[PDB]
């Protein structure tokens, strides 16, 4: 019943792009510092995930649009939207490096599996674990990636950790999740939409706890960015066809201009 969203951000402006799947069509809204507007992206799909990276100041966007079991990758490289080489379900994606490496996690029929890009083609990764819902975040430590995948069946969410030596279960404690991370520590915020309500758990480096965020919504996507050492987070909560943007900028959650 709800609409499904995915969101990505970049820069110290920042620019934001929000992709919304509604009745089988994905559309896009965009922020460049002074107001929202309708973006150029428009392609069919029932669920959506997104990641993006910068090479210098040039943004590259990848939108993963799922229908049935088929996911179609869409590519922004500064020159229109074009179909990617990637080959119902629900996806989560993350990327790192200037290469880039991509990893796309697909919840299909209760199992989550992984497809990876490393510059020379798509291949099936080692991640294979139960779940009805997936979200993902990652960070670099210099040049080594660390990945956390949040896998949900029922109301139970299991964190999976990749840290250079195989997957292991993390200590984090079908609902729908979204995740973001920042720093080298790192900090993590995970948001969960369950029975019409979105709540938040957070990692310091030292134990999980419940965050302050609590708003209605059957579907959540998030994005975040750093200005110096201050984190700025945007959470997009959807009920029916309405999406509200809540904003963390260091002092409580303010209502955003998103429409």
Ligand X SMILES: CCN(CC)c1ccc2c(c1)Oc1cc(N(CC)CC)ccc1C2c1ccccc1C(=O)OCCOCCn1cc(CO[C@@H]2O[C@@H](C)[C@@H](O)[C@@H](O)[C@@H]2O)nn1
Residues of this chain that bind ligand X (CB under 6 A): 16, 31, 62, 73, 75, 77, 84-86, 100, 102, 117, 148, 159, 161, 170-172, 188, 203, 205-206, 234, 245, 247, 256-258
Burial class (CB in 10 A: 0-12, 13-18, 19+), 166: exposed
Question: Does 95 belong to an annotated binding site?
Answer: no
Question: Does 179 belong to an annotated binding site?
Answer: yes
**Residue at shortest CB range from ligand X:** 170
Nearer to ligand X by Cβ, of 86 and 213: the residue is 86
- Nearest distance from residue 46's CB to ligand X, in Å? 21
Question: Does 46 belong to an annotated binding site?
Answer: yes
- Nearest distance from residue 194's CB to ligand X, in Å? 19
CA dist., res. 204 & res. 135, Å (int): 19
- Nearest distance from residue 225's CB to ligand X, in Å? 9
> What single string gives the DSSP state of each residue in 144-165?
EEEEEEEEEETTEEEEEEESSS
Question: Does 93 belong to an annotated binding site?
Answer: yes
- Nearest distance from residue 140's CB to ligand X, in Å? 13
The candidate with the shortest Cα–Cα distance to 67, out of 83, 40, 41, 90, is 90
Question: Does 9 belong to an annotated binding site?
Answer: no
The candidate with the shortest Cα–Cα distance to 47, out of 222, 221, 245, 258, is 221
Nearer to ligand X by Cβ, of 145 and 161: the residue is 161
Nearer to ligand X by Cβ, of 40 and 85: the residue is 85
Listed in sequence order, the residues at least 6 apart from 139 whose beta carbon sits closer than 8 Å to its beta carbon are 145, 146, 181, 182, 183, 184, 186
Nearer to ligand X by Cβ, of 196 and 230: the residue is 230
Nearer to ligand X by Cβ, of 39 and 170: the residue is 170
Annotated binding site for Zn(2+): 1, 46, 60, 132, 146, 218, 232
Annotated binding site for Mg(2+): 7, 93, 179
């Amino acid at each position: 019943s709800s609409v499904q969203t995915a969101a990505t951000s970049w820069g110290t402006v920042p620019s934001i792009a929000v992709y919304t799947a509604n009745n089988g069509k994905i559309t896009e809204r965009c922020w460049d510092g002074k107001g929202w507007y309708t973006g150029a992206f428009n392609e069919p799909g029932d669920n959506v995930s997104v990641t993006s990276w910068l090479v210098g100041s040039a943004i590259h966007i990848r939108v993963y649009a799922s229908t049935g079991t088929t996911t179609t990758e869409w590519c922004w490289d500064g020159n229109g939207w074009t179909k990617g080489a990637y080959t119902g379900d629900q996806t989560a994606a993350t990327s790192w490096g200037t290469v880039p490496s991509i990893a796309v996690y697909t919840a299909n029929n209760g199992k989550i599996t992984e497809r990876c890009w490393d510059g020379k083609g798509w291949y099936t990764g080692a991640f294979n674990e139960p779940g009805d819902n997936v979200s993902v975040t990652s960070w670099l430590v210099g040049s080594a990636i660390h990945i956390r995948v949040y896998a949900s069946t029922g109301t139970t969410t299991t964190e999976w950790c990749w840290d250079g030596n195989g997957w292991t279960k993390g200590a984090y404690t079908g609902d729908q999740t979204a995740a973001t991370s920042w720093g080298t520590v790192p900090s993590i915020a995970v948001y969960t939409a369950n029975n019409g309500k979105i709540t938040e758990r957070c990692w310091d480096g030292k134990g999980w706890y419940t965050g302050a965020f609590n708003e209605p919504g059957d579907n959540v996507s998030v994005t975040s960015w750093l200005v110096g050492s201050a984190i700025h987070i945007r959470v997009y909560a959807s009920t029916g066809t309405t999406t509200t943007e809540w904003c963390w900028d260091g002092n409580g959650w303010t209502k955003g201009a998103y429409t």
